[PDB]
Amino acid sequence: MDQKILSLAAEKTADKLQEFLQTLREGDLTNLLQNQAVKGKVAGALLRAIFKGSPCSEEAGTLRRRKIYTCCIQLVESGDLQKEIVSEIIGLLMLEAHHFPGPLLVELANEFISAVREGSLVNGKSLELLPIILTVLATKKENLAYLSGEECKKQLINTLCSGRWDQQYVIQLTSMFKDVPLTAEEVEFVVEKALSMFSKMNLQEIPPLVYQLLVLSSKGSRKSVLEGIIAFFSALDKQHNEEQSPSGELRHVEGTIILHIVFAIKLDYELGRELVKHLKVGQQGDSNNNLSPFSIALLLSVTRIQRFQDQVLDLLKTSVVKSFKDLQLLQGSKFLQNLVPHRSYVSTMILEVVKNSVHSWDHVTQGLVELGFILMDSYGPKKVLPSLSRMPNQHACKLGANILLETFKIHEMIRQEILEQVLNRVVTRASSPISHFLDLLSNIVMYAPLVLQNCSSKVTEAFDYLSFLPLQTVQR
């Protein structure tokens, strides 16, 4: 049956293939069904034969093209084929889908939308055809009326994002939109619908959706993606804290959304500026509720990107002193205790990060150590060698030692990085007051000399410097 189609397609076009096409009018469905039953290469051969035998100048062949489009679109999902014929079908349709007027592509896109609403896309490999069609509506300068074809693309995108999406096709519907030339408003619609779809999914299918959102962010809308993922996982952290009143699921999910946002900041140095601007506490004085144990772990991981290190550590330093000023102001007055309901402070959030980091978050903990020693180095005493210069600086410097002492206990690899840096500040400074480092070294030692006999030589190399120290430092 197919051999006469090949023999008419061999020599010339649109002179015998059209005439054979007006003999057999129906039953191309079961033809392609038995064709995929026998061989997929023959199906691609017949698709090329039909597509060259049915030009788009005449209007009789366009209906055969539409019917074979709906046939292949249903069989690429529903029909359990072999993979190569699937690739050849989608490649052939994607190639030949240029040559059309407006409304045929429009009703194709409407069939796609109406399918992805209700119709069980058995796999959903037909979706790859969808952006190509919309891309042709971007370049179809043939006028429509209901409009420009680009406006039909805007309306179809709005109809797709406003309607319900199925749970299984949010990764594929976001990955599709990476290839449509979108403006700001369309990509904000796509990210808004996609961020809306987070609560109705498996947790383990949130990191790749975040990844497609982060590569798709680069077009318009960075603030919305960052605000969305920080807000969603801050809410999850808080619900987990109330339920404690998944954790290796939640921590291994946040420990892969954090790397995605760090890598996307490395490849794109404006996603990092958007993250730093969106989280900064010092807007004028006021502490924001955008900081949480998630959103602070993300700042500590972005400190290993070398352009953001000083900027993010200085941000967390001013974000800790502001918290202690606020807490001192409330604790000194009942009138403020009546109004303000008891807020978690940045101190408690940081000490939650250090607890959380036990599992796999080694990326975070080299930034915890740097914040610890920035808090202690910057806020240690000097005035003995008052409340405002003293009590929110005493409380930050003792937050530092708490960061380093709790980080020292559980992270068995940044011993000798705290302990040779505590000692290096005790030994070498010896003119500036260093009581805080001797307190911290006393705590670190006293806690477990059983865990310091595995990192002991850092001690006995500071014994050789004991002669040149002042006497009180040697006694202490």
Binding site: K41, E84, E88, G91, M94, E128, I132, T139, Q306
Partner: protein, 683 residues
């Protein structure tokens, strides 16, 4: 130093990985490519010696370099990635997800890097020990299929290059079904832009000629290529075909030892008239040539008819009577001559390596056909300068897009190196009794190739070392005969004292000396591996006087070679070729008292006549004289005494002729002479 540092002390260095990677990254952001090479080596050794966490940090760093990037840093990172997939693909496979993720960021990347990128990704992909993570196959297929299926040619070229690159790497029977399905997809997407199909043919051809790979898909495709060519262009030799043409259409430029009332002839004018598929003639013939060289191992037994078949062209007589018409028909003629020249260049590229002597005669007739069409086309460009027939080379010039000096190297098909097997033959002279412009053409090509390589698509995938290695055979013991025959011509031309013969041979002499200068100024001779090639090369230059003194010391071969070379200074017609001779002698004598020869020879060129043709004195232009007097004034032992010689003859210019007892001394030349005089006085 860095190799010894890492390879000995990689236990001291291990615990400080991250600082090294913070260093390496700063030595890729710089210019000054020795620094960038250093940074590249830091990433290579950090990957090679450290443990499996630092390898992942290395690959992440290179991926950030590629994606974020600027041009040279991207190229360097792709070079390092090729070395890392060659070196240890096991530890590079564990970091396949980073490298797969490059595909989301291909807008920054330019298509000379895209070929390398898909090389890396396919070389990661097609190892049978990790078929279970075939996700990068799926993502590569997707980005290929989304590019290929696009109206925008800037994406379509990405698709074509990545597609055929995947195809070439997966060719080392199911796999053959995969390759043929992919290539059929590329063919289908290319068929309906012409230059897209041209780029397909070109890049597929480059894939054949660079990688030979398991020849199962090649013999699969070539049985379609030969048939498609022989029905696409091959017409039975009927004089006038159908169609309404205001031009007498014949079968021109047939070799005529072929019977005229025969089969194969090639349709051009009904094709290009139907356009207003002929633009793909030369690359498709290149593809046909390469697949039949892969099949029959260099034999072209069914394609010898392509060498001598007439071409269905209009009357390509110089249309000076066809003036006042610079309409679209003028562009038709210019594009026609352009296309047949590219076709002819592909023929002479095709049949140059063959050793049959009547076929060599056919090739030489093809070359003289080429030069006649070139002078006709430059006549047609002298008609109209504005009518560009824009068909660049598809690798670099087309993405730049999407008088005779530009199109001489950018527009025409590029000659191969083996085309210089032709000049084994000796010149014949038409006036005194392989012609002089048929040698001028090849030497004008070879000079441009040597200056491009040592100081151009198919050339630059060969290393400079293999280029100069094949130049050593295919120039020196072959062009020495042409040099000596030229010397014999200019001796008789001096004894006698038409003009176009001598005018062409002067440029032939100039190009021979320019090729010699470009060859012997090769900086790779400075490195201790290549002096044995010098112990070959100047030995052959030594062998033009006397043989028998084998295994000689170096400076003896230098002295014999310069003693051979000096004597040409009597037969030098012009100034620039003299400058090239003396600069050649300079750069060969820097391998060794020597200044006396150069100073005497510069004095000989200064006291030589150099006759008073207007364009001839124009070739004694200011900068060339400036360079020559810099050579003379620097290479004299007595600089101030030479200044007294020049100022002693600097005074009789006004007393004899308003032209001296020391020529190259006019009123106009004294600006140059004065400037070089007091400049060298200052130095």
């Amino acid at each position: 130093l860095l190799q010894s540092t890492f390879s000995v002390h990689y236990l001291v260095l291990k615990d400080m990985c991250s600082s090294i990677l913070s260093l390496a990254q700063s030595l890729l952001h710089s210019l000054d490519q020795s620094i960038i090479s250093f940074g590249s080596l830091l990433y290579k050794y950090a990957f090679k010696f450290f443990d499996t966490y630092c390898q992942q940090e290395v690959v992440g760093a290179l991926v950030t370099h590629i994606c974020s990037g600027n041009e040279a840093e991207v190229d360097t990172a792709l070079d390092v990635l090729l070395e890392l997939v060659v070196l240890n693909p096991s530890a590079m496979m564990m970091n396949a997800v980073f490298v797969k993720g490059i595909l989301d960021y291909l807008d920054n990347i330019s298509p000379q890097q895209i070929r390398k990128l898909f090389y890396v990704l396919s070389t990661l992909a097609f190892s049978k020990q990790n078929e279970a993570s075939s996700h990068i196959q799926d993502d590569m297929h997707l980005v290929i299929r989304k590019q290929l299926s696009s109206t925008v040619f800037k994406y379509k070229l990405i698709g074509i290059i990545g597609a055929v690159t995947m195809a070439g790497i997966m060719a080392a029977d199911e796999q053959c079904t995969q390759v043929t399905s992919l290539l059929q997809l590329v063919h289908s997407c290319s068929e309906q832009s012409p230059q897209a199909s041209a780029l397909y043919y070109d890049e597929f051809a480059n894939l054949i000629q660079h990688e030979k790979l398991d020849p199962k898909a090649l013999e699969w495709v070539g049985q379609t290529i030969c048939n498609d060519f022989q029905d696409a262009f091959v017409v039975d030799s009927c004089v006038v075909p159908e169609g309404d043409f205001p031009f007498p259409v014949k079968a021109l430029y047939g070799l005529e030892e072929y019977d005229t009332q025969n089969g194969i002839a090639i349709n051009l004018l009904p094709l290009l008239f139907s356009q207003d598929s002929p633009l793909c003639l030369a690359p498709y013939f290149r593809l046909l040539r390469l697949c039949v060289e892969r099949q029959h191992n260099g034999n072209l037994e069914e394609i010898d008819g392509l060498l001598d078949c007439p071409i269905f062209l209009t009357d390509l007589e110089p249309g000076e009577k066809l003036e006042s018409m610079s309409a679209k028909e003028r562009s038709f003629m210019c594009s026609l001559i352009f296309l047949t020249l590219n076709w002819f260049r592909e023929i002479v590229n095709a049949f140059c390596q063959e050793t049959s002597p009547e076929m060599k005669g056919k090739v030489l007739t093809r070359l003289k056909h080429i030069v006649e069409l070139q002078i006709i086309l430059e006549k047609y460009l002298a008609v109209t300068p504005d009518y560009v027939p824009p068909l660049g080379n598809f690798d670099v010039e087309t993405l730049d897009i999407t008088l005779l000096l530009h199109n001489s190297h950018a527009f025409f098909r590029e000659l191969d190196i083996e085309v210089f097997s032709i000049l084994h033959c000796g010149l014949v002279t038409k006036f005194i009794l392989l012609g002089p412009p048929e040698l001028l053409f090849l030497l004008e090509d070879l000079s441009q190739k040597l200056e491009s390589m040592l100081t151009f698509s198919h050339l630059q995938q060969r290393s400079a070392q293999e280029i100069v290695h094949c130049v050593f055979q295919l120039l020196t013991p072959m062009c020495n005969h042409l040099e000596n025959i030229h010397n014999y011509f200019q001796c008789l031309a001096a004894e006698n004292h038409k003009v176009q013969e001598y005018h062409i041979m002067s440029s032939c002499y100039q190009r021979l000396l320019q090729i010699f200068h470009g060859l012997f100024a090769w900086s790779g001779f400075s490195q201790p591996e290549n002096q044995n090639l010098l112990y070959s090369a100047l030995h052959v230059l030594s062998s033009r006087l006397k043989q028998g003194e084998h295994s000689q010391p170096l400076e003896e071969l230098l002295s014999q070679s310069v003693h051979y070379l000096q004597n040409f200074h009597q037969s030098i017609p012009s100034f620039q070729c003299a400058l090239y001779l003396i600069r050649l002698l300079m750069v060969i004598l820097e391998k060794s008292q020597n200044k006396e020869k150069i100073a005497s020879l510069a004095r000989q060129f200064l006291c030589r006549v150099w006759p008073s043709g207007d364009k001839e004195k124009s070739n004694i232009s200011n900068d060339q004289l400036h360079a020559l007097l810099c050579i003379y004034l620097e290479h004299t032992e007595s600089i101030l005494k030479a200044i007294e010689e020049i100022a002693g003859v600097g005074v009789p210019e006004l007393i004899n002729s308003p032209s001296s007892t020391f020529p190259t001394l006019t009123r106009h030349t004294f600006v140059v002479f004065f400037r070089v005089m007091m400049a060298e006085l200052e130095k």
